Design a protein around this ligand. Structure first.
Ligand code: ATP
Ligand code: MG
Ligand code: MG
Lengths: 598, 598
């Protein structure tokens, strides 16, 4: 509860507004011009008499009184800036309007009904009290009257103007910028456009809260450029497809990963796979083989031990948060890491992963920073010949993992990734999953890179795979594209991974074109991902950069729709999805409103 | 244009406010308190010097000034009533803040923010002239300053309160109603702000309402009331479960369809369904047997004639347009309305209905009226008394209807409607249902109405149904809640039809509460429909307004979210979905702008 009062030619109004409410206030603040008439001694001593409250006095430097239009507009801009500095973070402040002449009174009333105000009230006393003792006398006999003129919600989105700038470190006339007046022209232009052009007012879908300035709107509509890296780096993102076993494979990451191991040297730390010339912008297409062997230094060869796994998890989480990713899912193979002779089963590995992830998430949240929620995916790897029954084990593991009850990070679904082939098509294992759906799990599938459209159709219609993987050649089966679109089955795409595997973006002697633009035009729910960040040497931001020249003709609104698809085709509960919706909307609004300025 | 100005002690404010418009001003009206300090003689003479300017003086009878709360809201009542009396018919008024103490200043500036003013402004004089001789030179030397804070459109449509609420110039507040309607909106807005739930609002659909005035945004967050029925006769709606045969069951409509028959000897005018007291708000639950015995007057036995069918479909289209519905899906049974005696095959009947709907669409669109797009769904009933072979027939017909292609009205899916006594849970009809999905047709389901919610699982999975019918008892299956919510499977339900067949609150002896609020909170995609309009005797608007009694506390955001879900779950092309959303957003924005009290 913060009291805001405009100080004009009367001083007792501040105490009147303070002890107006019978319960009182824990915060009182006043704003005034450069009028030398006002003496702060009385208000200062009155505040000192109740130190439990906080008193701040704001003086409009450079102007003691209003003389012209320029003076009034400068005073109004200073008042607006001071007001936006005094917004309580969660609730709204109380405001008293009994101080000043009609001019600043009307200005503060308009500012209050603009940015909101918890309660707007006037104070008036018949006796016109002068001496403090008869403030208290008037309270005892009740000649001071408090009138409330309603409670307006205010403009919800305008409040956020704050970020644009709390204070410009003592703004001066030579460099004064009426930016909140630019917010006013923004809202005025938005309303006028809505009420003027019926055709333009027709075309407002997009991700919600599209009341941005028209300059910002057509900037977003402008095709995205390769120089927008900082924008998307500041823009929160979502990663629905990331592999745990391919984070630290090149650079200095492996040294830090090996630097902490429950074991001390039973780990080949020197030998590394040979590096491929040029990365991640290799101009020569390579297909598999060289991909995983580049990451052979990581994976089953490295995270068999405990502390190295914890170090890898911590570094992956730090990399995720450092890229402003708000939410992501990690694909990890428990049986690929379990060690029986060390009494480390797959269940123990998954429990350790869950514990470290939830501990890190809770620690990040408790500090009120930007914390990245993470859910886990277990991969039923198709290792072909070796011990078919192990696949069943993985399913059981999934069914027994999410049932652990408590935790903020939870096993959310299973995966069908592995050695894709005609024989290894999704119709082969169709008899096993009839139970995994019965327990409320979610199922994805990896097909389309090499499998036929029949395999994709079977995966969609037999396993009820709520998502897909890669699937770069749906254009040859329009019926398959149709049935994917109408069922709202999201498709996870890894731009850099396919760019390495295949050839597009004026690749040398490669005339194939990426289907992302056509995919988004047709309405498929593409979610841009990273697959193996360490192997591909690129995070989400670099994928979105390369999306510019990989699919020429993509605007920033396409990126926003891709983000919405990513946060829409992720297995999460409805309430959590709603909170994520709200937070993402707020963050995108803030980031675009701050990026337009420069 | 009309100028409204208020003055207190000062009297020289009005003529200075007159020179605000350089071109001149045509009518000016002034409201002031009963204070005798204000001198009307000088203003009267100044306005008689300009005979072309209409002058009217209004005084706050019985209130010299304000010295307490009661006087303040008394003056608020007088000022708001005089204001609403002084709106011009189409043009927003001009208002100035030059005269009066903070009380009236705040009052009329809040009024301008609420009712909307073309130009709110301020006039201040450096040399504060008191007579005409001084302010001539004061304006000629530029000392008088015309402060302005820009356009204040406010709520564009907040004037029907003049008509709905009668104007009473001569009265008191001690007498009665001061703002009443204004009191209602202020208290309800405040109460909503104390109790606001983005959780049930963050879900703000149709992003254009993010530009609605702040006084309007929370207005829809209030719980719905029956008096808002007129309003829900204005929003474009969607009706998906609307059987064709049940449109005409009684009234003059049955006479009209009977009279269009080519031969009147074979028309069974004899039968007359019995009436039930309190229809449509039945006082007792009615079983399914009596339910379709009530509709036995019409149906196939009366629609066999071609002209009868044509008249029926034309009247259904006309009534559907009368309900302001924009998109609809009609469930029809072709084989039911086919007689082989006159070479009237079922495919011919379907072609006739499709061509009639296409012709109506083209005729409505040519006149640029509010046409209603309609699609069709064949009905694959349970095929009572055995003889399931016809099932295949229907499905085959649907496929051949889908591939016709050209036109506006199309066949987008099939239906599974009928008795549950056969225990038709997917596998009973799964022997041949696999091929439908390959063709790309949609498939709904009407199951679980009275039996154990177990075959619903198979209907969701084995049938791959994209929508469900009724399933009111879905609450007691959390394992089914989680799947149906995560699968985004929509559910259609008709409040009037379910209330009639099963009985619900606030009926005595019926303790069952309608699960719509819980369903919406859980995040389900729920679509309110009408089933059979003629059977229920209530269009979609009545079905929507009955929710206030059926589910207390339902907000207008809930109705808008219901409409959004109905748009989402409809079986349509993706581009058609964007176009429908594009039209719906603008229509809903206009309806909400001109919504208040109608
Ligand atoms: N689901 C979420 N995911 C990530 N962060 C969240 C989530 N929910 C809340 N937060 C955090 O709540 C905090 C609220 O911050 P606040 O409302 O004060 O806005 P801000 O400080 O101006 O900018 P910022 O959002 O960067 O903190 C955010 O920092 C955000 O990181
Ligand atoms: Mg992968
Ligand atoms: Mg039905």
């Amino acid at each position: 509860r913060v009291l805001l009062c405009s100080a004009g030619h009367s001083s007792m109004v501040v105490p009147e507004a303070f002890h107006a409410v019978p319960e009182g206030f824990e915060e009182v603040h006043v704003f005034t011009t450069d009028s030398e008439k006002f003496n702060p001694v009385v208000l200062n001593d009155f505040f000192h008499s109740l130190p439990n409250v906080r008193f701040s006095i704001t003086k409009c430097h450079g102007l003691a009184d209003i003389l012209n239009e320029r003076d009034f507009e400068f005073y109004q801009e200073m008042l607006w800036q001071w007001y936006l500095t005094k917004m309580p973070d969660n609730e709204l402040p109380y405001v008293c309007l009994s101080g000043g002449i009609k001019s600043m009174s009307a200005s503060l009333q308009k500012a209050a009904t603009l940015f909101g105000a918890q309660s707007v009230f006037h104070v008036l006393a018949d006796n016109n009290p002068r001496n403090i003792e008869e403030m208290f006398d008037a309270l005892q006999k009740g000649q001071i009257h408090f009138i409330e003129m309603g409670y307006e919600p205010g403009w919800a989105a305008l409040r956020r103007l704050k970020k644009i700038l709390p204070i410009n470190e003592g703004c001066s006339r030579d460099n004064f910028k009426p930016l909140i007046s630019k917010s006013i022209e923004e809202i005025l232009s938005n309303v006028k456009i809505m009420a003027s052009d019926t055709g333009k007012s027709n075309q407002l879908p997009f991700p919600s809260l599209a009341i941005l300035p028209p300059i910002a709107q057509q900037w977003l509509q402008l095709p995205l450029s390769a120089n927008d890296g900082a924008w998307i780096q500041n823009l929160p993102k979502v990663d629905l497809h990331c592999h745990l076993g391919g984070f630290a494979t090149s650079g200095s990451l492996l040294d830090q990963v090996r630097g902490a191991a429950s074991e001390p040297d039973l780990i080949d730390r020197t030998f590394s796979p040979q590096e491929i010339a040029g990365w991640p912008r290799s101009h020569k297409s390579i297909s598999l083989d060289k991909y995983m062997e580049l990451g052979n230094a990581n994976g089953s060869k490295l995270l068999k031990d405990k502390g190295c796994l914890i170090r890898q998890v911590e570094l992956l989480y730090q990399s995720l948060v450092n890229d402003n990713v708000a939410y992501a899912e990690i694909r990890c193979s428990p049986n690929n890491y379990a060690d029986k002779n060390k009494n480390r089963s797959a269940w123990v590995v998954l429990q350790d992963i869950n514990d470290t992830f939830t501990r890190l998430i809770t620690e990040a949240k408790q500090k009120n920073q930007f914390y990245c929620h993470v859910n886990l995916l277990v991969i039923a790897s198709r290792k072909f010949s070796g011990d078919l029954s192990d696949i069943s084990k993985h399913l059981a593991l999934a069914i027994t993992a999410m049932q652990q009850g408590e935790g903020v990070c939870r096993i959310v679904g299973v995966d069908l990734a592995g050695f894709e082939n005609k024989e290894t098509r999704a119709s082969y294992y169709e008899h096993d999953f009839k139970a995994v759906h019965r327990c409320g799990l979610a199922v994805t599938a990896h097909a389309g890179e090499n499998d036929d459209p029949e395999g994709i159709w079977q995966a969609v219609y037999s396993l009820h795979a709520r998502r897909l993987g890669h699937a770069l050649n749906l254009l040859e089966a329009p019926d398959l594209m149709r049935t994917v679109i109408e069922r709202k089955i999201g498709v996870e795409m890894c731009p850099y991974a396919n760019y390495q595997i295949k050839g597009f973006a004026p690749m040398p002697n490669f005339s194939a074109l990426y289907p992302l633009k056509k995919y988004l035009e047709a309405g498929i729910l593409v979610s841009v991902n990273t697959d193996n960040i360490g192997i591909s040497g690129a995070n989400l931001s670099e994928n979105l950069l390369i999306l510019a020249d990989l699919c020429p003709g993509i605007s920033r609104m396409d990126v926003l729709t891709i983000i919405r698809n990513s946060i829409e085709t992720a297995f999460i509960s409805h309430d959590f999805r709603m909170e994520l919706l709200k937070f993402f909307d707020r963050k995108i609004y803030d980031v675009c409103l701050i990026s337009i300025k420069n």
